[PDB]
């Protein structure tokens, strides 16, 4: 879920950088050992 | 869940940088060992 | 959950930097060993 | 949960910096060993 | 939970800096060993 | 839980700085070893 | 680079857990923009 | 590079778990833009 | 770089847990923008 | 760089726990914008 | 850089806990904006 | 940089706890904006 925009007019550089990001690692869930339980 | 915008008009540099981010590590869940319990 | 905006008009530099962020580490959950308990 | 805005008109520098952030470390949960207890 | 705004008109510098933040360390929870107790 | 605003009109400097923050260290919870007790 | 051993003789439980690990996140390198420099 | 061993004799449980691991994320290298530099 | 050993003889429990770890987050390197400099 | 050992003879419990660790957060490097400087 | 040892003979409990650790937060480096300077 | 040892012979308890640690927060470096200066 994301929307990215790059818009420019008159831009002068030698060295310009732009960077976006959200996530690089896990988010949920690795293991379960159980006998009773409701979960999502 | 994110919305990013870069908009510019008259910009002059030698070296310009822009950077966004939210997350790099885990968020939830690594392990469970249980006998009784309701969870999410 | 985030909304980021960069908007500019007349900007002059040699060296300009902008940076945003929220999170880099864990948020919840590493382990449980239990016999009785309701949890979320 | 966050909303960030950068808006400018007439800005002159050699060196300008802007930085935001909320979190870099954990927030909750590392371990539990128990026999009886309700938790969240 | 946060809302950040940077808005400016006529600004002149050589060196200008702005910085916000809330948190860098833990907030809650490292360990428990118990026999009886209700917790959150 | 926070709301930050930076708004300016006619500002002239060589060197201007602004900084906000709330927290850098822990807030609660490191360990418990108990036999009987209700807690939060 | 690792060596793990689990060796046991007479062991009695209902619930026994063992866990090892080293790394879950990055170690090095995300980006570079440069004009002059020796690096590794 | 790893060596793992599980060896057991007389073991009694209802629920026993064993887990090893080293790595789940990147280790090196994402991008470079340069004009001069020795690297590895 | 690690060496882990679990060795036991006569052990009696209901609930026994063992856990090791070194690292979960980054170690080095996120970005550079430079004009002159030797680095590692 | 680490060496961990668990060795035991005659041990009796209901609930025994052991835990080691070194690191969970970053160690070095987030960003640089410079014009002249030697670094490591 | 660490060496951990747990060795025991005749040990009797209901509830025994052992815990080691060194670090959970950052160690060095968040940002730099400079024009001249040697650094490490 | 650390060396930890736990060694015991004849030990009797109901509830015994041992805990070591060095660091939980930052050590160095958050930001710099400068025009001239040698640093480490």
Numbering used by the authors:
A (entry chain L), B (entry chain K), C (entry chain J), D (entry chain B), E (entry chain H), F (entry chain I), ...: 1 to 40
From the reporting publication:
One fibril morphology, termed hereafter morphology I, was relatively abundant in our samples and associated with a relatively small width of 7.4 ± 0.4 nm and a short cross-over distance of 41.5 ± 2.3 nm. Implementing this symmetry, we reconstructed the three-dimensional (3D) map of the fibril at 4.4 Å resolution based on the 0.143 Fourier shell correlation (FSC) criterion. The fibril consists of two stacks of peptide. The cross-sectional layers of the fibril contain two Aβ(1–40) molecules that fill the entire density, demonstrating the absence of major disordered regions. Each peptide stack contains four cross-β sheets, termed here β1–β4, that extend between residues 2–8, 10–13, 15–19 and 32–34. The β-sheets are uniformly parallel with respect to the orientation of the hydrogen-bonded β-strands relative to one another. The β-sheet twist is right-handed, whereby the direction of the twist is defined by looking along the main fibril axis. The central contact site, which occurs close to the fibril main axis, is formed by residues 24–26. The two equal contact sites at outer radial position involve cross-stack heterotypic zippers between sheets β3 and β4. The stacks are offset from one another by ~2.41 Å, corresponding to the fibril pseudo 21-screw symmetry.
